[PDB]
Amino acid sequence: VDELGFNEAERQKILDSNSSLMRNANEVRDKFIQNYATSLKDSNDPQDFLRRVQELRINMQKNFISFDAYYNYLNNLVLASYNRCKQEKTFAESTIKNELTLGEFVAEISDNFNNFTCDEVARISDLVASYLPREYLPPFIDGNMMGVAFQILGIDDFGKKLNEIVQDIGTKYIILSKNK
C-alpha cells in the first residue's frame, strides 16, 4: 500500500501530535533574549562578560526557562516516529512477498526515520544554542569564553543530553533497518 515508507503525511502527524511542547518556542526565546541578554554586548571585559552570563542564567531560572522540556519533546517525537515505522515495517513484512521489493520499503522507512528525527534534533539543538545570542556577544569574546558561557547557561549540559538521544535514534535506526 501507499501508506508505507513513513510518508510526509505520517511524519506531519507526529509533528502536530507533539507540537505542544514547542508552542511559541521561538517567540519565548526572542523575548527572553531581548529582555535579559542584550547587555552582554556591553560587557567591559572577559570576566565581566562571564559575570553577566551568570546573571543571565539566574534570570533564566527565575523565568522558568527550561531546556529539559525540549529534551522530552524530542524523546516523545523519536518514540512516536519509531512506533509508526515499526508498525509500517511489520505490515510490509506481512504484506510484501518479493524480498527485494520489501527491502525497498524497509530502507525507505528507516531512512526517513533517521532523517526526520535527526533534523528535528538539529532544529532544537540550534534553538537551544541561540540562548547565548551571537548578536549580543562582545567583540573581545573568543571560542573559549563562549565555551564557558555555554556551560554556565545550561546549554553544554543540554548538548550532552541531546547526544544520548541521537545515540538512541542510531540504535532505533539499527532496529528498523534490519536487512532481509
The resolution in angstroms reads: 1.9
Cα–Cα distance for residue pair 62/94, rounded to 1 Å: 54
Cα–Cα distance for residue pair 35/131, rounded to 1 Å: 12
Count CB-CB contacts under 10 A for residue 12.
11
Give the residue carrying C-alpha cell 535514534. 169
> Containing domain of residue 88, as a range?
1-180
SS3 of 76-93: HHHHHHHHHHHHHHHHHH
Q: Which of 64, 171, 173 is nearest to 114 (CA)?
A: 173
Q: Which three cell numbers stand for residue 11?
A: 511524519
Length of the chain: 180
Q: How far is CA 129 from CA 67, 88, 146, 147, 180, in A?
A: 10, 35, 11, 11, 40
Cα–Cα distance for residue pair 83/175, rounded to 1 Å: 12
Q: Which three cell numbers stand for residue 133?
A: 545570542
Amino acid at 127: L
Q: Which of 175, 119, 13, 143 is nearest to 151 (CA)?
A: 143
What CATH number did the domain enclosing 119 receive? 1.20.190.30
SS3 of the chain: CCCCCCCHHHHHHHHHHCCCCCCCHHHHHHHHHHHHCHHHHHCCCHHHHHHHHHHHHHHHHHCCCCCHHHHHHHHHHHHHHHHHHHHHHHHHHHHCCCHHHHHHHHHHHHHHHHHHHHHHHHHHHHHHHCCCCHHHCCCCCCHHHHHHHHHHCCHHHHHHHHHHHHHHHHHHHHHHHCCC
Q: How was this structure determined?
A: X-ray
- 133-148-78-168 Cα dihedral, nearest 10 degrees: 160
Number of domains into which the chain is organized: 1
Half-sphere exposure of 115 (CA within 13 A, CB side): 11
Contact by Cβ (8 Å): 113, 82: yes
